[PDB]
């Protein structure tokens, strides 16, 4: 399984590296999409912007629930773009939301996977079968905690949370 990373800033301050293992052996299509968006491999998408998480933000953070990001298109939670040229199907729901660090796809209903993702800060069992789990934070979960700290009940952060750098680790 490939391992990818985010180097994060919170309020402009470096906050650490989040390291994620991608379940390519369980969700090959979903993993590859995420992995590719970490490296920037694919270049420019249909949106005219690089297919790359680098520089994008966590725009929706709810403490005790999850941190959501992945909109490198509009940078406001409405955008995002997969590497397949369109939204892609829910590959499978084998993996469940079993606790903190769970990496899963945000969507707009069935078969609408783009680039928006979320990292759980607890068990989110109610999302089972609706959101494709495809990864797990394996290092730097404490960095996710720092992100969680600036969240709110509305989801608005109170400091900008930015992916300062990102890519593939192994």
């Amino acid at each position: 399984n490939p391992k990818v990373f985010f180097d994060m800033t919170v309020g402009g301050q470096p906050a650490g590296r989040i390291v994620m293992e991608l379940f390519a052996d369980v969700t090959p299509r979903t993993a590859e999409n995420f992995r590719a968006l970490c490296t920037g491999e694919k270049g420019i998408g249909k949106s005219g912007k690089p297919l790359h998480y680098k520089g994008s933000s966590f725009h929706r953070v709810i403490p005790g629930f999850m941190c959501q990001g992945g909109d490198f298109t509009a940078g406001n939670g409405t955008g995002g773009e997969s590497i397949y040229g369109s939204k892609f199907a829910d590959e499978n729901f084998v993996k469940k939301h079993t606790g903190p660090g769970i990496l899963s796809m945000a969507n707009a209903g069935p078969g609408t996977n783009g680039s928006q993702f979320f990292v759980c800060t607890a068990k989110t069992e109610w999302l089972d079968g609706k959101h494709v789990v495809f990864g797990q934070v394996v290092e730097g979960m404490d960095v996710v905690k720092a992100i969680e700290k600036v969240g709110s009940s509305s989801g608005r952060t109170n400091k900008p949370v930015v992916i300062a750098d990102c890519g593939q680790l192994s």
Binding site: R60, A108, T124
Partner: peptide
Amino acid sequence: XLLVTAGLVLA
């Protein structure tokens, strides 16, 4: 509620 959607944020 506690959802994670992309466009229309629900309760």
